[PDB]
Amino acid sequence: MFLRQEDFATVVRSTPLVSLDFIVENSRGEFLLGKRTNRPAQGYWFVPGGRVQKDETLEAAFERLTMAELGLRLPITAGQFYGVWQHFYDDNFSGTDFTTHYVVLGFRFRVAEEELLLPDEQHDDYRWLTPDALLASENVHANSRVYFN
Amino acid sequence: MMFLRQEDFATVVRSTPLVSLDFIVENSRGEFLLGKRTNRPAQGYWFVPGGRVQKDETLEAAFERLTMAELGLRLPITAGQFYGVWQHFYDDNFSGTDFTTHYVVLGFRFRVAEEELLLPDEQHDDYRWLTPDALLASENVHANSRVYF
Numbered sequence: 001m002f003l004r005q006e007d008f009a010t011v012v013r014s015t016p017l018v019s020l021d022f023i024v025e026n027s028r029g030e031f032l033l034g035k036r037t038n039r040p041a042q043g044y045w046f047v048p049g050g051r052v053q054k055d056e057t058l059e060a061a062f063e064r065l066t067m068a069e070l071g072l073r074l075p076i077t078a079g080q081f082y083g084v085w086q087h088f089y090d091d092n093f094s095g096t097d098f099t100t101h102y103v104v105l106g107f108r109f110r111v112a113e114e115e116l117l118l119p120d121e122q123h124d125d126y127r128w129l130t131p132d133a134l135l136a137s138e139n140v141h142a143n144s145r146v147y148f149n
Numbered sequence: 150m151m152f153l154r155q156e157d158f159a160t161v162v163r164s165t166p167l168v169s170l171d172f173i174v175e176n177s178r179g180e181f182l183l184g185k186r187t188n189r190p191a192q193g194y195w196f197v198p199g200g201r202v203q204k205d206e207t208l209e210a211a212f213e214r215l216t217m218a219e220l221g222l223r224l225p226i227t228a229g230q231f232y233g234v235w236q237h238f239y240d241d242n243f244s245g246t247d248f249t250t251h252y253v254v255l256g257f258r259f260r261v262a263e264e265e266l267l268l269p270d271e272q273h274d275d276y277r278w279l280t281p282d283a284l285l286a287s288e289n290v291h292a293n294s295r296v297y298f
């Protein structure tokens with residue numbers, strides 16, 4: 001259920017979003033971050049992830065979101081559950097007039113870089129970063145840095 | 150902003166998953182608390198106490214608000230044992246049968262002293278402390294509560 005703009009605005013204004021964030025490792029002990037082109041956390045390096053839709057199972061969401069974010073569909077069985085997190089932003093997808101709140105389910109998994117097809121819709125660049133490098137940069141959003149604390 | 154007007158809550162339930170905390174509440178003898186629900190969804194079923202997280206509310210704050218509202222006893226989230234992520238889908242909703250309800254649920258288990266609760270009558274018309282074997286044997290205990298045991 002991909003909502004029309006009016007109803008997505010009302011939803012974001014009124015209730016927490018539920019999302020899956022992906023802690024994606026390569027063959028070198030590095031993790032995938034993309035530089036976000038959408039609000040919230042626009043212009044920051046952030047892990048790939050997205051919200052779960054109405055009446056969508058977590059199993060279905062994991063497949064839809066891995067395909068949408070990484071260009072590679074993976075089943076939820078590939079992910080290692082990595083906690084429940086909470087992300088609060090002062091802005092939203094279409095403005096700076098109300099806040100966004102996510103309750104986030106983290107999942108960690110390792111992939112082969114050559115099997116991904118990284119899309120350009122939500123990020124304008126992608127890097128595989130070591131925990132030390134990502135923790136040392138203010139350009140990586142705090143909500144992504146904490147996964148590596 | 151937090152407790153929504155009915156109009157806004159209806160839009161939310163129609164359009165996106167709710168995020169809730171369900172409480173697996175044990176007494177000193179190893180029995181667990183179930184209430185007979187007076188509201189939709191799962192109306193008329195025995196169910197664990199629990200409720201949804203509000204916009205811009207931390208999970209820590211929601212746990213305190215919800216234990217107080219559900220049990221008459223405020224407990225901190227540190228008292229709870231994380232008990233998994235679950236998903237509950239219902240064909241009806243708080244206002245009737247016009248649309249479905251979807252919850253992404255964070256389970257928490259903890260023991261209380263029965264004598265210290267002040268069980269409210271707003272959401273349940275009866276309460277029982279049941280053994281796992283007993284609650285598992287009854288179709289009047291909703292499947293979404295039975296699975297915790």
Ligand SMILES: Nc1nc2c(ncn2[C@@H]2O[C@H](COP(=O)(O)OP(=O)(O)O)[C@@H](O)[C@H]2O)c(=O)[nH]1
Binds near residue numbers: 002004051
């Ligand atoms: N109109 C609309 N936009 C959405 C919906 N869900 C997500 N979006 C937007 O679609 C894009 C991708 O969604 P998602 O990956 O879930 O969002 P993220 O938290 O920004 O990474 C972002 O620009 C979101 O703001 C929806 O139901 N309706």
Ligand SMILES: Nc1nc2c(ncn2[C@@H]2O[C@H](COP(=O)(O)OP(=O)(O)O)[C@@H](O)[C@H]2O)c(=O)[nH]1
Binds near residue numbers: 169200
């Ligand atoms: N108007 C309104 N009602 C709500 C809201 N959140 C929950 N409710 C209703 O308030 C009561 C208690 O909420 P909760 O414990 O979260 O619901 P449960 O899932 O039915 O146990 C139920 O009747 C819900 O339908 C809200 O933001 N606005």
Ligand SMILES: [Ca+2]
Binds near residue numbers: 048049050051122
């Ligand atoms: Ca995304």
Ligand SMILES: [Ca+2]
Binds near residue numbers: 198199201219272
């Ligand atoms: Ca409740």
